[PDB]
Ligand binder design. Sequence first.
Ligand SMILES: Nc1nc2c(ncn2[C@@H]2O[C@H](COP(=O)(O)OP(=O)(O)O)[C@@H](O)[C@H]2O)c(=O)[nH]1
Length: 178
Amino acid sequence: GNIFSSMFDKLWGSNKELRILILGLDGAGKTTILYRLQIGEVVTTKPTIGFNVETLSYKNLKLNVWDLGIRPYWRCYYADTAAVIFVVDSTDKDRMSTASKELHLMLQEEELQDAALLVFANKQDQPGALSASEVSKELNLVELKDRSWSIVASSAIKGEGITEGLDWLIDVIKEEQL
Ligand SMILES: Nc1nc2c(ncn2[C@@H]2O[C@H](COP(=O)(O)OP(=O)(O)O)[C@@H](O)[C@H]2O)c(=O)[nH]1
C-alpha cells in the first residue's frame, strides 16, 4: 500500500496536520475505501453516544470516516478539514435522495467553506448501478459553485477508481495548501 503512502507524502510540509473526511450514507462503502489504503493505523472511537468514528492516522494526515443520516459533535472535525470524500452507493436509487440532502447540509457548513470535494460513485461493478454522470446529476454537483469538486466511478472492493480519484484530490489539497 506504499503507492498510496507515496501519494499522501505529497501533503507533507503543511504547517498544520491535515484532515480528510470520508462521508456518506452507511453501506456506501466508506470503510472499505479506508481499509483499501493499507497505510498508517486505524482506530475506532465513540466520542458521543450513538456515534462511531473510524480514524486512519498517516504521518501528518488524519482520515475520519463516519456514517451520515448533523449532530454538532461533528463540528469538531471541520476545523482542520481539507476536503471531504463523499461515498455514494450507486445501486441504491432510493436513498439516493437522502444522500444528496445529507451531502449539501454538510457542504453548507461554514468551516468547510474551502474543503475540496471528491465524490465516489461506488459499486459500479454491481447490477443496476447509476453511472457517474447520473450521480453528478442526482447530487446537483453541477449547481455547486466556488468549490473544488469532482466525481469518479468506483469499485472500492476491487479498488477500481480509488487511486485515480485520490490522485486528483491530493493534488487539489496540496495546491490549496500552497
Ligand atoms: N460490489 C461492491 N461491494 C462493495 C463496494 N464498496 C463496498 N462494498 C461492500 O458493501 C458493504 C458495505 O461497505 P462498507 O465500506 O463497509 O460501508 P460503509 O463504510 O458503511 O459505507 C461491504 O460488505 C463491502 O464489501 C463496491 O464498490 N462494490
